[PDB]
Design an enzyme around this catalytic site. Structure first.
Site, PDB file in Angstrom:
ATOM      1  CE  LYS A 111      -2.985  -2.908   0.909  1.00  0.00           C
ATOM      2  NZ  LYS A 111      -3.571  -3.945   1.783  1.00  0.00           N
ATOM      3  CG  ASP A 165     -14.038  14.916  33.558  1.00  0.00           C
ATOM      4  OD1 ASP A 165     -13.760  16.008  33.118  1.00  0.00           O
ATOM      5  OD2 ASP A 165     -13.771  13.800  32.994  1.00  0.00           O
TER       6      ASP A 165
END
Ligand code: NA
Ligand code: NA
Length: 327
Positions: free
Chosen positions: A64, A184
């Site tokens: 690839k 958070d």
DNA sequence: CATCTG
DNA sequence: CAGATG
């Protein structure tokens, strides 16, 4: 960082599709180490074979690379970017609680869009519901301008229910960061620790309060130490109401608050570096503790922490202000 | 990792 | 309980 740019980039583009569309965790895992290695690599890779010479680099990948270095594209990558099927999976997933596994089953039943979703709201769980309900609201980032207002409110509340609580809003917020993704808070309590056998109320009591005042509009999940839901800042004098935002709340034994707090403040980088050095200093760290490191290989036995200071000190270091905990 | 679905 | 999501 830029000399192997495309390589690691198409690499990662593939890895993704392995894990997300195909269930291909092995391949996914493959595409990944390579993208990591050619990544850490110092040369300007000029060929598949040059590449192949690398661990992680096999032949499938090497091929690839050749094709990519050969032409600005890769077909498989081009085929995937069209595939309405592969597309839908990247989409659906965007939905809170819709994972890939889910993304599939939907698409197969032919639920491909928001519209599709809505239409079949019945088939999604509570989480996916909220998720679909606030899809826009959830993508938007949070301004520190709202961030502060939020934190202001939560902080007042907890204090309200118990003076003994300790909270902190970690994250990027904590570092300065002009905008957050979700909130958070880290919770604690004197009466909460490693040994102390629980106090659940400890989490719920606060949760409750959050809704009492109506800040927390929905619950994504609640447990005995972790809570995940939705919130909102009150809309002033009607004309401008706030987007629904994500929040997490979590209990910590007062004995490991600092480490968590440290840890959770990040960045990831400031972490390893802190971590790597803490190793030199003959120590060990994780989200919960600091342990005097032995020689015989490894050793434990939790060192004592009273502020993020104690830890820094342990490893003999410059106490950083959160601002400068970048890297 | 801790919660949830089922 | 396995499996999924965050
Ligand atoms: Na998702
Ligand atoms: Na299995």
């Amino acid at each position: 960082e830029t000399l192997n740019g495309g390589i690691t980039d198409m690499l990662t583009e593939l890895a993704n599709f392995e894990k997300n569309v195909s269930q291909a965790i092995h391949k996914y895992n493959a595409y990944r180490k390579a993208a990591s290695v050619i990544a850490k690599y110092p040369h300007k890779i000029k060929s598949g074979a040059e590449a192949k010479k690398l661990p992680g680099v096999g032949t499938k990948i090497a091929e690839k690379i050749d094709e990519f270095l050969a032409t600005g594209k890769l077909r498989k990558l081009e085929k995937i970017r069209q595939d309405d099927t592969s597309s839908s999976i990247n989409f659906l997933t965007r939905v809170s609680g819709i994972g890939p596994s889910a993304a599939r089953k939907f698409v197969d039943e032919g639920i491909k869009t928001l519209e599709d979703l809505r239409k079949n709201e019945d088939k999604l769980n509570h989480h996916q519901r909220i998720g679909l309900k606030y899809f826009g609201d959830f993508e938007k980032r949070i301004p520190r301008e709202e961030m502060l207002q939020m934190q202001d409110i939560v902080l007042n509340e907890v204090k309200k229910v118990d003076s003994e609580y300790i909270a902190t809003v970690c994250g990027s917020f904590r570092r300065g960061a002009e905008s957050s993704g979700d909130m958070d808070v880290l919770l604690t309590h004197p009466s909460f620790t490693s040994e102390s056998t629980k106090q659940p109320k400890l989490l719920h009591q606060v949760v409750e309060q959050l809704q009492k005042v109506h800040f927390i509009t929905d619950t994504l999940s609640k447990g005995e130490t972790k809570f995940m839901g939705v919130c909102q800042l009150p809309s002033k004098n009607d004309e401008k109401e706030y987007p629904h935002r994500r929040i997490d709340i979590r209990l910590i034994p007062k004995d490991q608050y600092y480490c968590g707090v440290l840890y959770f403040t990040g960045s990831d980088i400031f972490n390893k570096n802190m971590r790597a050095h803490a190793l030199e200093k003959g120590f060990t760290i994780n989200e919960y503790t600091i342990r005097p490191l032995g020689v015989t290989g490894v050793a434990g036995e939790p060192l004592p922490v009273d502020s993020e200071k104690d830890i820094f000190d342990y490893i003999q270091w410059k106490y950083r202000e959160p601002k400068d905990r970048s890297e």
